[PDB]
């Protein structure tokens, strides 16, 4: 029924646009309020966990709004999940209405 290309592309573009222009302020505020995980009062890296060091390929990006590549993958994942949910629900031809 629904075009996989059009639905997937539209959902991914919409999710990226929402996460880059709409949900970016709240996301940044929540990230600043939460911060990195801490154990006994200090971050995992400070306690001695070398593998807990934040990756450098996300510390700073050329994007003016700070929209990192990980942000792209997260929002794209949400967009694909919604797109495939729509496609799968539209593929079924049964009556799920409680009426």
């Amino acid at each position: 029924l629904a075009d996989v290309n059009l639905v997937v592309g539209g959902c991914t573009v919409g999710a990226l646009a929402l996460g880059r222009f709409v949900f970016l302020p709240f996301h940044r505020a929540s990230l600043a309020k939460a911060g990195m995980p801490k154990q006994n009062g200090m971050t995992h890296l400070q306690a001695g966990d070398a593998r807990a060091e934040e990756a450098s390929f996300i510390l700073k990006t050329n994007d003016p709004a700070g929209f990192t590549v990980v942000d792209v993958m997260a929002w794209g994942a949400l967009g694909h999940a919604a797109a495939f949910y729509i496609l799968a629900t539209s593929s079924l031809g049964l009556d799920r209405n409680p009426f």
């Binding site: 990230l31 911060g35 990195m36 995980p37 990756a55 990192t68 997260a74």
Partner: protein
């Protein structure tokens, strides 16, 4: 750079009016530092799941010709 911090979530689960007191402040360290706390939580969950498994395998047999085997059930 993305995800949740369990410490902040626990420190934020403090209902106003002080009905629960300080709430869950310091619980993250109480669970992470103590191995017995984690073992107790894991044992409670595992025991409950074992009971759930026992209650679901007889009412909803998942293996073929299992309901006919009265001894095995």
């Amino acid at each position: 750079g993305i995800g949740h911090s369990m410490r902040e979530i626990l420190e934020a689960q403090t209902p106003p009016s002080g009905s629960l007191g300080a709430g869950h402040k310091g619980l993250y360290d109480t669970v992470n530092n103590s191995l017995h706390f984690q073992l107790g939580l894991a044992l409670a969950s595992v025991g409950t799941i074992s009971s759930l498994v026992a209650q679901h395998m007889y009412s909803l047999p998942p293996y073929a010709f299992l309901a006919q085997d009265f001894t095995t059930q």
